[PDB]
Design a protein around this ligand. Structure first.
Ligand SMILES: *[C@@H]1O[C@H](CO)[C@@H](O)[C@H](O)[C@H]1NC(C)=O
Ligand SMILES: O=C1Cc2ccc(Cl)cc2N1
Ligand SMILES: [Zn+2]
Length: 217
């Protein structure tokens, strides 16, 4: 998160910290959010050979009793996810067992301001953050994201005032974008120089597919 503040620890009990395993390189990291005791929503491009989920975390380098490190049994990436257009950047993770409900861990059931949180990098050349950072971003008209050639208003949200530095960035993918407390978007992609706006998956469009996956599993 660029241009944000450190969250009050555990003020966002649904936040999930993802460690992703591939076969040809070291681990990668994304965010995500617990929508069912055993289901975590994140970005399609965070998929890997295997994934571990830590719930209840603030400072991700210091273990604490709030922590729930959970195994992912199955990854449900959207079937139509496109590595060329980046369309349908969305994935459901099924946890091996249902998470415990605690104070620190629980499910989450243009021109306006939304908020987005993550453990991602705090600047173009900065490392990922140790602690959960958040930032408030402006929801933009779709023409503000026209320069992303495959951006699609129906599928995506355009997020972030270009006059401001604030933004999600690497490591923040899969995190929820909340407007008035409700999840509206998912961190997906943007420019490598982090100049806003950036592109978020529009959750509402994928709601049928989401419900589909839940009931079948
Ligand atoms: C997080 O924890 C580590 C030690 O576990 C510490 O070195 C680091 O400065 C901490 N960061 C914050 C801001 O709490
Ligand atoms: O909002 C975001 C998320 C993200 C990931 C990676 C890059 Cl290069 C840019 C952005 N912008
Ligand atoms: Zn704590």
């Amino acid at each position: 998160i660029i241009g944000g503040t450190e969250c009050k620890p555990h003020s966002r009990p649904y936040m999930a910290y993802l460690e992703i395993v591939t076969s040809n390189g070291p681990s990668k990291f994304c965010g995500g959010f617990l929508i069912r005791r055993n289901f975590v929503l994140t970005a399609a491009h965070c998929a890997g050979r295997s994934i571990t989920v830590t719930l209840g975390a603030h400072n991700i380098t210091e273990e604490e009793d709030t922590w729930q490190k959970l195994e992912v049994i199955k990854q449900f990436r959207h079937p139509k996810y496109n590595t060329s257009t980046l369309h349908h950047d969305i994935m459901l993770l099924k946890l091996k067992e249902k998470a415990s409900l605690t104070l620190a861990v629980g499910t989450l059931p243009p021109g306006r301001m939304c908020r987005v949180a993550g453990w991602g990098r705090t600047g173009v050349l900065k490392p990922g953050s140790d602690t959960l950072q958040e930032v408030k971003l402006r929801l933009m008209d779709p023409q503000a994201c026209s320069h992303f050639r495959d951006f699609d208003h129906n599928l995506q949200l355009c997020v972030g005032n270009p006059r401001k530095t604030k933004s999600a960035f690497k490591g923040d993918s899969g995190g929820p974008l909340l407007c008035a407390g409700a999840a509206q978007g998912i961190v997906s992609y943007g420019r490598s120089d982090a100049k806003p706006p950036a592109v978020f998956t529009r959750i509402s469009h994928y709601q049928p597919w989401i419900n589909q996956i839940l009931q079948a599993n």
